[PDB]
Design a protein around this motif. Structure first.
Motif: not given
Lengths: 100, 62, 92, 88
Positions: C4-5, C31-32, C74, C1, C7, C29, C27
């Motif tokens: 993971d942000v 909600k980041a 996105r 995790t 993309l 995430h 690209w």
RNA sequence: UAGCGGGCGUGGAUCCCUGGAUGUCCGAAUGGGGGAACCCGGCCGGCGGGAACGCCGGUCACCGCGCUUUUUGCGCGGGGGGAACCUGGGGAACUGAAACAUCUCAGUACCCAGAGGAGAGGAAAGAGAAAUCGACUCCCUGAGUAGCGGCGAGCGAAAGGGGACCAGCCUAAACCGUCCGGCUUGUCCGGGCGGGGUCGUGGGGCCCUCGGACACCGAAUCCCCAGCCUAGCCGAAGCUGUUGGGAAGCAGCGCCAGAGAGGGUGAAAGCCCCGUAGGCGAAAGGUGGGGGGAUAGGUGAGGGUACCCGAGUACCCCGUGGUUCGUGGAGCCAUGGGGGAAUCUGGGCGGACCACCGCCUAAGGCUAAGUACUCCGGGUGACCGAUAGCGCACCAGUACCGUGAGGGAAA
RNA sequence: GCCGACCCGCGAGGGCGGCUGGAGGUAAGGGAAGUGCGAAUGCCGGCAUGAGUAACGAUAAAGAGGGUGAGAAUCCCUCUCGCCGUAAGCCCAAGGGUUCCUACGCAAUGGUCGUCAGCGUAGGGUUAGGCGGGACCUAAGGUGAAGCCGAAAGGCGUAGCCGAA
RNA sequence: AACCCCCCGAAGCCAGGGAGCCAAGAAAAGCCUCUAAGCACAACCUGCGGGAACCCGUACCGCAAACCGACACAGGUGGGCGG
């Protein structure tokens, strides 16, 4: 479930229609549509190339999916229905009087 | 059959299990982005790789 | 995790203009945070990131026959690397 | 409302108006109304402090049993309405 | 769901079944806010130099009941949803009366709250004319009867009989021990708990006597099991030729049948396929007195005493509803308003009321079954066959119309 | 389903023959109904009439040469002319929600055309401590511990909270 | 490149400007200050150096062909500039 059918990839006879009597080695069962394929059915696909990749696609007349109720398996005889006896251990199929 | 091999040696992953496990999956997700990247440029990834990778993570995360 | 942000790299003529400076863009995430983006990419490429920017991308709606639909949305983010350094993988 | 020991709601039974002999006959004109209980407030000491009671006259006295009953009943610790709830 | 692009399985996948796992944000939504799916937080620990930032994990809504000394804590539980059905709280008008007020439509429609696989109802203050039936529920009947009704429109019971089912219980109260609290310390008032007790041949308490007992009675409670549901397997018997694009047809001779229901196979198949008849099957979850076992709880006589036996209730009156009963000779059950008992030499009911004679134990509570229902799964049809059948056979409660409730296709 | 001048029936009808069609039909005798249509300004769908008619949505106004293209009055370029200029120009907010840009294209959409577009396919495009809003404040109003009221649903309502051009 | 001089000059800015009038003209916080709890190894205020600073909108149309009028509808839409 129960999509299991007559047989798999092996030696199977054809009492179908236009290929009544033709016996070949079936190279593909497709349980999604209840149809197999041997060496029998062979319609000529006039089409160019099925997928854009590659030059020309050949007039391939390759096997066409046949309906499974028109195909009977066969061993030391000429194709029987499939009863199923069992051992002391696992279980496979024996035809009307033979084996395998 | 990939399953068999991986799972067994994750309870073999019990020399320093929990702590080590956290660490393990952490590096695994890296081997993931590297792929999604390579599968963004075009010619550098042949599918499955990405998939099977995720599915291992799936189990590892137990 | 953690990895993971981020993309994937945003691949476009304009994105490539950002390589001229430390202004890499990819690209991210939905909600980041610009805060957890910096932290993320930094621990993803071990490069100190001075300035961070996120903008949002509404996915255009495309139609495939009589069936109408909607592409995902996105969140494009552009980063700024400690004056000088670069990202070898994105420079490609 | 109904409230206290009273345990008595507000019946919406109707009232019909009649014109008659009765040694001559009888006839009508009818409608609906609602009847209410003789609800009144009850101030009472009890334990410490005061406490209000909203009951019908029919059962006011039944409040004045409760009070002689909270005497073999342990009740203190600044309990405003807590008293009332713990009032049976 | 093919194609691009690649991978997996007899070291037994896909798939199916049981359980476990992760399950973003909204939504009873519950940290606070909020224009649902979005904003902003408190505390504890962690992550990135990480104090400023950020993020992750856990935790923080409210109400009720019981411990917690008040305090703060801890524990159990409520909140919303449900096709229809159910009970209770409310409660229409059109309409019919060939007007229209009573009446009807109707306690229907609908609103609300609550309940569960049901719900309600239920151990007689019963029924009602047999010195007799005997909880309740439902079906049939009684019966369009008794009766109600501007005696108009119309409305419409009950016992009894026939059947389904079967089922009976616990408590409040007199009394005794106990802890605690109070206070004019009493041989006592109360509160909690335990013992005691539960009835209509009246019962129970208290004292005496009998022998008071090994015995009986026995769960709606508990454990085990069968069976059972949630995936599945075995499953008999046909070949040749002939017409044809294709046979299953036509024909020749065979065969199974606890299976010749049905369906597919290029047309018309008991025999090819899937099945069918018959018979097998659960590690797991689920279910389950149908069987066994155990427990909780229950069982005796006489006599003396006069204690007890559900209170603003009975009962009476005023205003009312329910009932076949519309104020009628108007009882009974229910209760808004006022007055207001008794503990069996008691109270109710038997259609105003009185007397006799009979029925019954109000003012506390729980109880399986029969019953309704059809979202859900299965079976079947003198049901539909695409303007039919659900609105929807089809990417439909969609398109589209409306601000909105809502309406609503075609194909 | 189409067809007939044949046969039968008083008729409704029935039968036979040719054609189309391609997988169902259901005697005799009975049985039960969602059982016979020309009208309901019926319902639904299809298609006519009017009709090659009105119209083609402002009387601000166009012409030409060149280019592109299967095709051009209508796309592109240049020139000349015309109209707006308190706007028919340029900003912001609301509402719109990808209509922006680039490439490819014209069945439909465009009241014609169409090589063009706001249309079809595809890809790209919106960057913030300082702008706007939120981790600031309150207004009407709303929500709402407590409290008061209501057969239920609820009504009012302090504190706090939400509330902005 | 020049980037200068002269002039008209705003309802705008200085802003809480000044006058007169009656119909008598929001609230709250930031901003200042006072003190209580509370602390005074804190804290607040001043400078300096360094570090930290989120979520959301951001295109395009926006008197119209992209908003409201079923429509490339002669209608409808608030604020600023408008030589």
């Amino acid at each position: 479930r129960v999509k299991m059918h007559v047989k798999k990839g092996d030696t199977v006879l054809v009492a179908s229609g236009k290929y009544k009597g033709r016996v070949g080695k079936v190279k593909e069962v497709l349980p999604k549509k209840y149809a197999v394929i041997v060496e029998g059915v062979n319609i000529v696909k006039k089409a160019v190339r099925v997928s854009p990749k590659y030059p020309q696609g050949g007039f391939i007349e390759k096997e066409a999916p046949l309906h499974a109720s028109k195909v009977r398996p066969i061993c030391p005889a000429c194709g029987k229905p499939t009863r199923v006896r069992k051992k002391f251990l696992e279980n496979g199929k024996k035809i009307r009087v033979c084996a395998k | 059959m990939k399953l068999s091999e991986v799972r067994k040696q994750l309870e073999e992953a019990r020399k320093l299990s929990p702590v080590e496990l956290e660490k393990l999956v952490r590096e695994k997700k890296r081997e993931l982005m590297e792929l999604r990247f390579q599968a963004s440029i075009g010619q550098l990834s042949q599918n499955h790789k990405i998939r099977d990778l995720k599915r291992q993570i799936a189990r590892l995360l137990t | 995790t953690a990895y993971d942000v981020i993309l994937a790299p945003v691949l476009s003529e304009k994105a490539y203009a950002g390589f001229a400076e430390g202004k890499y863009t990819f690209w991210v995430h939905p909600k980041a945070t610009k805060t957890e983006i910096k932290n993320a990419v930094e621990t993803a490429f071990k490069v100190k990131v001075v300035k961070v920017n996120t903008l949002h991308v509404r996915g255009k709606k495309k139609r495939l026959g009589r069936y109408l639909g909607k592409r995902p949305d996105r969140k494009k983010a552009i980063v700024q690397v400690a004056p000088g350094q670069k990202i070898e993988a994105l420079e490609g | 409302s109904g409230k206290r020991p009273i345990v008595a709601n507000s019946i919406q039974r109707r009232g019909k108006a009649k014109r008659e002999g009765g040694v001559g006959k009888k006839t009508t004109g009818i409608s609906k109304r609602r009847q209410y209980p003789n609800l009144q407030k009850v101030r009472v000491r009890v334990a410490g402090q005061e406490i209000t009671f909203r009951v019908a006259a029919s059962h006011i006295p039944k409040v004045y049993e409760l009070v002689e009953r909270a005497k073999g009943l342990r009740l203190e610790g600044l309990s405003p309405k807590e008293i009332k709830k713990e009032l049976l």
